[PDB]
């Protein structure tokens, strides 16, 4: 196991291929994504490898709502003063594509119930 | 007040009833009165956080002890083919109450985008 993992959120946590990244410290990374659902769209991850949040462990409490303050405070950042939701997707009834944990934030636009 | 002024503190409070389906000394699931998939429940913190944006940097584990439990609630209600969890914040993110809370919806394919 590399350090990021290996999908290819670990290709972007190890640097070797760019992403617009908002902010970084060292437990996460948060960047734009590249199909955005709304006119601001990114992803907060951890730079731990968790799989899924089926698989978290009970340790890893603080990581998972690092992820949401993290989010928070980058929303602020990018000027979401109206809004915006966050999601995280479970396995294949969730729509998960990347097997390794991640927070979507989406806003700029109004979001509808119910989501998706 | 302590749990505060929304109708999710009432339920807190045990002032009016609630489908409950867990409870610890911090937080409190339970389903969703108007529900949008097969299964789909609120897990909410005791301590009143009226939305995420709000949310200070010590209430991180409590923020990610809502997702732990509602993690384990999801497969104590039969969910193992996945589920969504969703936060909303504010009027474009379709909050509905004032109180922070976080949904797991699950026992359908849910669809993109997530509103
Ligand atoms: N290299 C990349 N840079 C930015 N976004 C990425 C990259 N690859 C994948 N993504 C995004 O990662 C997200 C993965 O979320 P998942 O919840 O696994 O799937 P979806 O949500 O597309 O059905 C998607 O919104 C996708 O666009």
Not at 67 to 86: E, F, Q, T
């Amino acid at each position: 196991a590399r350090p990021g993992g290996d999908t290819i959120f670990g290709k972007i946590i190890r640097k070797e291929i760019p992403a617009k990244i908002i902010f970084e410290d060292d437990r996460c990374l948060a960047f734009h994504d590249i199909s955005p659902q709304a006119p601001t769209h990114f992803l907060v991850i951890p730079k731990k490898h968790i799989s899924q949040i089926s698989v978290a462990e009970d340790d890893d409490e603080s990581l998972l709502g690092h992820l949401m303050i993290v989010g928070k405070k980058c929303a602020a950042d990018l000027g979401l003063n109206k809004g915006y939701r966050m999601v995280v997707n479970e396995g294949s009834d969730g729509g998960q594509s990347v097997y390794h944990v991640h927070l979507h934030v989406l806003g700029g636009r109004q979001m509808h119930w119910p989501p998706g």
